Amino acid sequence: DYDELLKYYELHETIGTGGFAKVKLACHILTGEMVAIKIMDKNTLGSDLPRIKTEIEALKNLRHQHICQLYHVLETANKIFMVLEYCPGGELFDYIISQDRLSEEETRVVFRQIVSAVAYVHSQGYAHRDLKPENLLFDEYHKLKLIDFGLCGSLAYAAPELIQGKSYLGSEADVWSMGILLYVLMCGFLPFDDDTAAALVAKIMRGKYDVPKWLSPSSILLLQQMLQVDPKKRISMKNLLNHPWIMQDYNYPVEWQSKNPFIHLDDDCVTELSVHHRNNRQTMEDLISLWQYDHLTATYLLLLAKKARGKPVRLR
C-alpha cells in the first residue's frame, strides 16, 4: 500500500525497469530533495524475503562515497519500499554497450571506484557476492555507486567455487567477479560466454579465455591474478589496492576508506529538525540516534546532503 509513502514523497516518473521490482523518481516533500524509490513486492519475493531483509540490514551499516545511500525503509502489508540516493547516469551496463569498450585509462578510473567500494564492504565484515555491471550506477558526476538486487544472468560473473556450492570466502568471490568486470570494461564482452548453463559453467571451471590484441601486457597480468580458478591463488584485496596496474596513471593506492563516515550528529541538521518537530535538542538527538531508517532518518540524511551541497539547511 501507498498511503503512508505518499504522506512523505511525491512520485514522478518510473526510471528503473525490472521483474520483481519497479523504481520511481520522487521528491522528499519536507526537504524538496529528489530520491529513487525501489518498490519490492513481498509475495513476489516469497522465501527470498529473509535474504532481502538481511541485505537491507547490511546496507543500513554502510556509508561510503561509492555506495548508494539508503534514506528510508517503509514496510506495508505487501510491499517494501527502499528510498535511495538518485543516481541519474544509469547503469554501467548500458554505458559499456554505448561506448563498445572503455579505454585502458577510463577503465582504470572506473575500476578504482569499484575496488574502493568493495574494499569498504569487506572492511565492514560483508561481501557483495553479486558484482556485475547491472549492480553499478553512475551519479550526475559520472562517479560509480554500488547497488544490489539488480537484474544466464550473474552466472557469468560467479566464481567457480561459488558455482559449485562448496565452501568459499565472500571476499575471494568478489575478487573473481571484479576480474570479470575488468575484462568486460576493457573488451565489451565476457571472458566466459555460452548458450547454456552447462557450457558456461564448464568454461568457467577450466578458466581459459581469449586475450584480445588490444589488451596491454600489464592488463593481461592483472586479469590472470584476479581470474585464478583456485581461490587461494587469487590476488587479495590488500594487494589489489596498490597493484602496479591500479597505480599506473595515478600513482597512489585506492582510497577505500569512507570519506564521510557518521561520527557525531551534525548540529545544523539537528537544530533545524528541533525547530520543525517542536522538540529540544537532547530529545531530538535521542530520536535521531535510534537510526530506525524511518521518515526521521530520511529527513536527517537529506538535510545532511543539502548542507554538503552548500544549500541552506532548511525544511519547507
Ligand X SMILES: CCOc1cc(OCC#Cc2ccc3ccncc3c2)ccc1C[NH3+]
Residues tagged in the binding site annotation for ATP: 15-23, 38
Residue 44 and residue 20 in contact, taking contact as beta carbons nearer than 8 Å? yes
Choice between 29 and 34, CB closer to ligand X? 34
Please give the annotated binding residues, written as ranges: 15-23, 38
Q: Quick one: cell of 144?
A: 560509480
Nearer to ligand X, 55 or 268 (CB): 55
Q: Kindly tell me which of 63 and 101 has the beta carbon lying closer to ligand X.
A: 63
Least distance CB 18 / ligand X (angstroms) = 9
Residue 182 contacts residue 226 (beta carbons within 8 Å):
yes
Following CA atoms 311, 15, 19, 107 in sequence, which dihedral angle do they give, to the nearest 10 degrees?
A: -80
Mark residue 26 as left, alpha or beta (left: phi above 0; alpha: psi -120 to 50; beta: remaining).
Answer: beta
Q: Can you tell me the distance from the alpha carbon of 185 to that of 294, in angstroms, rounded to the nearest whole number?
A: 38
Half-sphere exposure of 6 (CA within 13 A, CB side): 5
Let me know the angle formed at the C-alpha of 288 by 57 and 304, rounded to the nearest 5 degrees. 90
The nearer residue to ligand X, 39 or 223, going by C-beta atoms, is 39
Q: Give least dist CB 311 to ligand X, A.
A: 20
CB 83 within 8 A of CB 73: yes
d(CA 171, CA 118): 9
Centroid of chain to Cα 72: 16
CA distance 186 to 213: 11
Classify burial at 236, counting beta carbons within 10 Å of its beta carbon; exposed 0-12, middle 13-18, buried 19 or more. exposed
Cell numbers placing 221: 597480468
Identity of the residue, 136 or 200, whose beta carbon is nearer to ligand X in the bound complex: 136
Pairing outcome for strands 33-41 and 79-84: antiparallel
Catalytic residue among 130, 139, 174, 193: 130
Please confirm, yes or no, whether 1 is among the known catalytic residues: no
Alpha-carbon span 220 to 102, nearest angstrom:
15
Closer residue to ligand X (CB): 59 or 200 = 59
Please give the residue ranges that form the binding site for ligand X (CB under 6 A): 15-16, 23, 36, 38, 55, 58-59, 62, 67-68, 82, 84, 86-87, 121, 128, 137, 146-149
Q: In whole angstroms, how close is the CB of 144 to ligand X at the nearest point?
A: 11
Which residues are catalytically annotated?
A: 130
